[PDB]
Amino acid sequence: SVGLIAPLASPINIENIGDGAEVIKRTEDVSSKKWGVTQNVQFDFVKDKKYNKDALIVKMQGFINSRTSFSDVKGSGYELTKRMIWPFQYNIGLTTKDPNVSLINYLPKNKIETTDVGQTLGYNIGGNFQSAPSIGGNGSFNYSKTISYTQKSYVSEVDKQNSKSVKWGVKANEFVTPDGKKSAHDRYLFVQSPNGPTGSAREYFAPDNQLPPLVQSGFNPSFITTLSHEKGSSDTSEFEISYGRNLDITYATLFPRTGIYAERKHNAFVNRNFVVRYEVNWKTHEIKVKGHN
Numbered sequence: 001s002v003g004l005i006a007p008l009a010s011p012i013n014i015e016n017i018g019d020g021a022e023v024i025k026r027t028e029d030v031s032s033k034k035w036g037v038t039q040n041v042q043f044d045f046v047k048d049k050k051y052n053k054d055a056l057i058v059k060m061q062g063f064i065n066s067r068t069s070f071s072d073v074k075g076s077g078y079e080l081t082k083r084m085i086w087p088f089q090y091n092i093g094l095t096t097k098d099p100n101v102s103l104i105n106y107l108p109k110n111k112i113e114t115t116d117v118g119q120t121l122g123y124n125i126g127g128n129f130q131s132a133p134s135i136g137g138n139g140s141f142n143y144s145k146t147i148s149y150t151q152k153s154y155v156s157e158v159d160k161q162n163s164k165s166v167k168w169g170v171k172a173n174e175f176v177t178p179d180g181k182k183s184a185h186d187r188y189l190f191v192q193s194p195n196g197p198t199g200s201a202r203e204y205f206a207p208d209n210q211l212p213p214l215v216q217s218g219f220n221p222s223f224i225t226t227l228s229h230e231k232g233s234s235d236t237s238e239f240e241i242s243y244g245r246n247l248d249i250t251y252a253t254l255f256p257r258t259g260i261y262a263e264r265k266h267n268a269f270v271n272r273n274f275v276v277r278y279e280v281n282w283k284t285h286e287i288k289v290k291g292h293n
């Protein structure tokens, strides 16, 4: 054994990650007021003399407002019918738009149903990427990036994962209510009788203190994918990052002397996403937003 006479772990913007390698860190913050989305993206170029390919670790963060709304339904005969529009699923995806780039890793890589999601992408010099479905107490990497998000009552699925694109869906699953657990497909999910016959639209639905954050507020994504570039090919590549929602409609009609009658319009508005196009310049190690927003 020779663990005692090993080299030092640390023998010695842009971060030096070891001999002949550095990470050039770029960021883009693109928001849409109309979409209620903020894409806060980190783009880390792995510049390594011992890795025959250029690599870009893309960490997708930011915010997707739930856009949950509670409204009157206009029209005679609908005075006692109210509508709640809410996100059944949050969509996060990255699609490559040029043949000279491919995706070589994705986090989360598998479906995850825990309330807390915390994972790590590690990089070791010479092109070695590794992933762990946990944070802390992992191996020894030259560089690492983590993802962290909470999805109470929702589950994360890999909807699509290939050399050109990755799509995750953070989908409604099971909710705690004062009347017991309810499935995301229960048509009575979130409805309630208002306090009186003149009760506002908001009163026909579960109060804020009963709605989990992905329904009441929104989602704070935290996802990773690494783009691989075959050297010799074009210095530039384009790709799109999409953040959005699939919305359901819940209708609640009050029959004052009887109670509530509920209806669900499932998948009422699908793939309602904010798409941003970016261009990687592998030569200058730069990112620019195409068209912007």
Ligand SMILES: NC(=O)CN(CC(=O)O)CC(=O)O
Pocket: 268, 269, 270, 271
């Ligand atoms: N915007 C679209 O065309 C996509 N979707 C829209 C939606 O269902 O909300 C329908 C489809 O094309 O199947």
